[PDB]
Design a protein around this ligand. Structure first.
Ligand code: HEM
Length: 366
C-alpha cells in the first residue's frame, strides 16, 4: 500500500475515482477529520431518528448502530461526557499494577521454546482489562471473542443492513444480565435519558471496540522492534513510550476512516459534492514526507510524533490513554523477561485496511 500512498501523496493528495473520495496527505486528512461541520460522522442514521429513539418508538434495531462513534455534535458531546473522564490519564493510572500483575501472569504461560504470543499475550490482555474496568465478567472468552468479530468497529462505510440475528441476541442478552454488577461507567449510562438501545450501543462499544485494535498494536510493536532489532536499545536507552508511538505511526492498527460531507466543500483543490463519502487514509498521512522527516524509516526516538493513528478532533480515540498504557506495560515486561527473541512464524490478518496478526509464534529462550 505504501508505494501507492507515496505516489498519490506527490501526484494526487485528494483523488476521486468513480464512487468514493480518497485523501492521502497529512494536511487534508487532518483538515477532514477536524472539520466536523463539513465532514460528518452521521453514517448510521443516529440523527435522523434520535427523537423516535428517545420517544421509545424503536426497539428491534442493531444497538451498535447508535453510539458516539457515529455521531455529530451536540449529540456527540452529550454521549462522550458520560465517560470522558473515566479513561483520562491518572484516573487510569490507578490500574498500572493490575495491568502489570496480569501481564506477568500471562507471560508465565508462555513456552520459551515456542509459543504464539497473539494467543498467549496480545488477545487476552485487552479483554481481561476492559472487563475489569466495566465490571462485566467474561466467562465466554471464546463465545465472547465471537461477538467482537461480529460487532466489528473497523471504521469503514456502515453496514447497509442493520437487521438482528441470533448471535447478536446472545450478546444483547449477556449485556442485560450483567448490566447490573457494572462499574461507575456503566451506571452513568444505565441512568440517563438515553433510550435503552442507545445504552446497549454504548456498553457494547466500550466493551468491544478497542480489543482487536489494542491486540494488533501489541503485535505490530513486537514484530517491528524485532524486525529492526531495537529491543536492546529500547531496553537500555529506556524509550518505551516514544517507541510505541513510532509503532502506532509506522504500523497503524486501522489504516483509514470514513466521513460523509453534509455540505458542498472545496478540499485544497478539488471540490467534493454534498452527500459523497470520503475515505481518509491515516496510514498514508503518517508517512507524509512533509511532516515526518524520514517518514519511511522506523525511528524509535522521533519525539515530536504527531501521528493520526488515534484520530484527530472531537472523535479522537476515547481509549487512547488506555491503549498506550497497556501496550507500554506489555512491552516493558515482555522485554524484561526474554532478552532474546526470534520470530519463527507469523500470519497476518486478512483484511487489508488493518495491521495485525492472526498468530505470531516466537522462540524466546529464557
Ligand atoms: C491501539 C488501539 C487503538 C487504536 C489504534 C484506536 C483507534 C481509533 C481511531 C483512529 C478512532 C477515530 C475514529 C474517527 O475519528 O472516525 C477511535 C475512536 C474510538 N475508540 Fe479507539 N483505538 C484504539 C483503542 C481503543 C480502546 C482500548 C478503546 C477503549 C474502549 C477504544 C474506544 C474508542 C471509542 C469509544 C471511540 C469513539 C470516540 C468518539 O467518537 O468520540 N479505542 N479509535
Amino acid at each position: 500500500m505504501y508505494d501507492w500512498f507515496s505516489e498519490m501523496r506527490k501526484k494526487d493528495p485528494v483523488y476521486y475515482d468513480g464512487n468514493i473520495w480518497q485523501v492521502f496527505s497529512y494536511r487534508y486528512t487532518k483538515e477532514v477529520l477536524n472539520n466536523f461541520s463539513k465532514f460528518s460522522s452521521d453514517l448510521t442514521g443516529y440523527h435522523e431518528r434520535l427523537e423516535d429513539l428517545r420517544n421509545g418508538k424503536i426497539r428491534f434495531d442493531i444497538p451498535t448502530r447508535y453510539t458516539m462513534l457515529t455521531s455529530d455534535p451536540p449529540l456527540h458531546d452529550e454521549l462522550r461526557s458520560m465517560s470522558a473522564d473515566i479513561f483520562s490519564p491518572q484516573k487510569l493510572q490507578t490500574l498500572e499494577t493490575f495491568i502489570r500483575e496480569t501481564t506477568r501472569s500471562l507471560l508465565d504461560s508462555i513456552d520459551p521454546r515456542e509459543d504464539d504470543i497473539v494467543k498467549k499475550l496480545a488477545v487476552p490482555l485487552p479483554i481481561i482489562v476492559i472487563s475489569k474496568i466495566l465490571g462485566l465478567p467474561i466467562e465466554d472468552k471464546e463465545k465472547f471473542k465471537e461477538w467482537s468479530d461480529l460487532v466489528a468497529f473497523r471504521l469503514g462505510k456502515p453496514g447497509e443492513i442493520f437487521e438482528l440475528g441470533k448471535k447478536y441476541l446472545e450478546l444483547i442478552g449477556y449485556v442485560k444480565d450483567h448490566l447490573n454488577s457494572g462499574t461507575e461507567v456503566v451506571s452513568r449510562v444505565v441512568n440517563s435519558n438515553l433510550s435503552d438501545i442507545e445504552k446497549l450501543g454504548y456498553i457494547i462499544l466500550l466493551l468491544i471496540a478497542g480489543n482487536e485494535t489494542t491486540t494488533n498494536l501489541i503485535s505490530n510493536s513486537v514484530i517491528d522492534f524485532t524486525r529492526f532489532n531495537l529491543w536492546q536499545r529500547i531496553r537500555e536507552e529506556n524509550l518505551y513510550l516514544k517507541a510505541i508511538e513510532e509503532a502506532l505511526r509506522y504500523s497503524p492498527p486501522v489504516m483509514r476512516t470514513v466521513r460523509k460531507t453534509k455540505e458542498r466543500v472545496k478540499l485544497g483543490d478539488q471540490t467534493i459534492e454534498e452527500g459523497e463519502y470520503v475515505r481518509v487514509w491515516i496510514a498514508s498521512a503518517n508517512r507524509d514526507e512533509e511532516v515526518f522527516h524520514d517518514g519511511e524509516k522506523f525511528i524509535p526516538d522521533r519525539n515530536p510524533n504527531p501521528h493520526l493513528s488515534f484520530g484527530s478532533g472531537i472523535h479522537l480515540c476515547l481509549g487512547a490513554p488506555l491503549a498506550r498504557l497497556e501496550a507500554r506495560i506489555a512491552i516493558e515486561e515482555f522485554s524484561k523477561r526474554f532478552r532474546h527473541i526470534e520470530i519463527l512464524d507469523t500470519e497476518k490478518v486478512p483484511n487489508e485496511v488493518l495491521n495485525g496478526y492472526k498468530r505470531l509464534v516466537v522462540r524466546l529462550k529464557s
